[PDB]
Structure formats: structure tokens, C-alpha cells
Design a protein around this ligand. Structure first.
Ligand code: A1BSH
Ligand code: ZN
Length: 139
């Protein structure tokens, strides 16, 4: 679990969005596993606007942060789950690192700010949904 709070927006994994997120919907994209809802309170976070390919992510299944080298956002095939059929997920970045289901929503940060959130994983891999291209989060 986890979210990004920036301005009057909450950014979550689309597959973990709540009834309240859907009732306050701003934008969602199944192909990216992202959903953004509106908030009444002003948010705690800064979004990176950069091309970093290194950063640090929070891994809830270890209660620890780990450094990572990650690929640029791309279209990656993701196996079927209870939430989606087998499909290509866009704007996804992969890295070598521990992840389990339950780790979705953990933040990836570089020195410039928040880069994205955990969205996929596998045997020693972790995948992050990029948010750096969503320029409107800042206004
Ligand atoms: N973005 C998606 O389609 C997600 C939906 C939930 C499921 N998903 C995953 O990758 C999960 C299932 C297998 C596994 C192993 C280690 C970490 C994670 Br996170 C996962 C894809
Ligand atoms: Zn950066």
C-alpha cells in the first residue's frame, strides 16, 4: 500500500484505489496502473522532473529503503493477475530489488523528488509506475 500526496491530488495504484478515490476521480489509466483522486487537504510531496535512472525505494515487506538502478519508462509485458488480464503496462521502470505483493504503493525517490510508485515485481525484480511526465500534478 501507499500513495503520493501532491497539492490537492492523491496518486495511488489503480488496482488499490478505494471507493473514495473513485468518487473523487481526476484521472486514471489502466495501462499505467495509476489513478489520481482529489483531496481537501494540501499534500506533503514534490514530484521529480528529471531523467534520473538511480534512486531509493521503500520496501514495505522489509520495512526498509533500498538503492536501485532502474530502466527508463517503457512498455513491459505483465502477466495476468486478479486485477488485470495479461497486457502491456506502459510507463513502467524495472530494477533489481526485493518486492512482494503488498509492496505496491511504495515510493521511489531521486535527489529531485518523487519518481514513481511500486507497481509490479517478480523474482528479485521490482517495477515502478513513473509519474514524472504528469506535469499537471504541480498545478
Ligand atoms: N501492475 C500490475 O499489473 C500488478 C497488479 C498486482 C499484481 N502484480 C504483480 O506484479 C504482483 C504479482 C506477482 C508479484 C511478485 C512480486 C511483487 C509483485 Br507487486 C507481484 C502486477
Ligand atoms: Zn532525479
Amino acid at each position: 500500500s501507499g500513495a503520493i500526496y501532491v497539492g490537492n491530488y492523491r496518486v495511488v495504484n489503480r488496482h488499490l484505489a478505494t471507493h473514495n478515490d473513485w468518487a473523487n476521480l481526476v484521472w486514471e489509466d489502466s495501462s499505467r496502473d495509476l489513478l489520481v483522486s482529489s483531496t481537501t487537504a494540501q499534500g506533503c510531496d514534490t514530484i521529480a522532473r528529471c531523467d534520473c535512472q538511480t534512486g531509493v525505494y521503500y520496501c514495505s515487506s522489509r520495512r526498509k529503503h533500498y538503492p536501485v538502478s532502474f530502466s527508463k519508462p517503457s512498455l513491459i509485458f505483465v502477466e495476468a493477475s486478479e486485477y488485470y488480464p495479461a497486457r502491456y503496462q506502459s510507463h513502467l521502470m524495472l530494477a533489481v530489488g526485493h518486492s512482494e505483493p503488498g509492496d505496491c504503493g511504495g515510493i521511489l525517490r531521486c535527489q529531485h523528488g518523487v519518481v514513481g510508485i511500486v507497481s509490479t515485481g517478480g523474482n528479485g525484480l521490482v517495477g515502478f509506475a513513473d509519474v514524472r511526465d504528469l506535469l499537471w500534478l504541480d498545478e
